[PDB]
Amino acid sequence: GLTDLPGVGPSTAEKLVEAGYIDFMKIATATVGELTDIEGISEKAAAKMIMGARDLCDLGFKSGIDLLKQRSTVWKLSTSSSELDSVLGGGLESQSVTEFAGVFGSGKTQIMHQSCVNLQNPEFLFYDEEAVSKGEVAQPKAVYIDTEGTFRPERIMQMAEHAGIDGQTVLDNTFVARAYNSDMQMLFAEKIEDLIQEGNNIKLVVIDSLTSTFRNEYTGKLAERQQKLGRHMATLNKLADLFNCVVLVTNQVSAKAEQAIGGHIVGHAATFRFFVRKGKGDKRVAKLYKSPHLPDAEAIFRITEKGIQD
Template identity: 45%
Template structure:
């Protein structure tokens, strides 16, 4: 294994700065930008470029064949949502190395699925989990440990042990939210087996802090930075990223849905899978897959019960 000190232009002092800034992992270093590395590790941008280039050579980052990509995808894991119908809709569950976004109106089940996944990621692989732990970035004070206990009990798990494997970050504004996402690298490098990152909800702070068209460009730049950090975590550590998102009315919509997800094209392009949650009759919820790189659009029906998400 290549150590930081083995890279050209990296002495003990620089290596220490890199580790303190959360760049102890070679792949994390190889996928950083020069500007990001220079700012966080407090080194010159020229030095940062050389260090990144050396890390890319060490990781052999270059062109690869489609066969190599297929082989790498064999490492992709999936986390059950608790609903067989929803799992089948999205190809077997929430996927690692990808960003899955669910959006819908209030009460459509977004936070309920978040709590469910925080538990099911801890299940063994043969039961739909990844034997892993969860990071839960809570922006709207929606996380409830009591709900986790109910779901854990339904799966026959020790709810105290389950709660110990969910790492909560209460984000108080968009800058704090971005910072907590960037700190996930440090948590993983410290030895925590994080396999799922949840942000509930992604856009709440951005929506509240950046009001009006004049602030839209700044908001989208910060959002892009945030999504880039989450995508890096997903790709570097084979982690699933699950985002909940709000919707807004479309007053000009004469046909189709009267609402749309917020976040614009930046979020639309960053999300690997997009799922629209809707309220149905008799307490049912409808999950509609609206975007995927390889799966067809479709719908699945599920219910939210005391035990969690069920068909």
């Protein structure tokens, strides 16, 4: 527990738990100011527990085989499409933010729904059991921050039915928050940590859409928009890392051919970026154009009554 930390006694631990610092990584990655803002915690005590948490979490230089072990803590979520899983190097990655931008109706929201369904199929989580334990991915839950009102429980049921999963179980293990503007959107994202503290193993976070709120609220003001968006994406990236979570976001496009909106801050902050377009009928094509370790490539798949397939 928190009292394992230097300078931290039962009293200080109570103050930390109340201020939301319940595990070591959050303390190890905190700033002294951040902790001193907690009544009762001094600069000296704050600096001492941060150093102790870094030490207990072994956050130092690593080399050799240890570098491979860190990469092995990443687990991946299947998309239900073999070509898409392949272009992704296996599946959607935990500890990163993956963005699907695309023209209207291309399937961005369908992919988000399919992901909430797939999270409830144990065989769709791919991981190295020696680096990620069965308990770490047990009873996974998803958080869907819907900023457009397009969450559709009947779609969840249909995709689950076709996947052989129970639809009600997916709805029971998915938290949906409807955000009507960028302030709500950002706050819900900041509150995911509270869901985790309440015992929910959040392993998938969806922000659909990442930018439609900001784009119609900040139309001159393009700096304050970029600033707020940057804070939001830092929160997303940090939660993906600290909670070994897959974070997926959708994005719209504008002319100039098309470019995902959101400018440089969204461009730098999204770890993986895709452009999704429609093919003939129910065919879709997802083009990976940014990733840390894979070549750009395209995946053809379909969206049908069953969800994503092929």
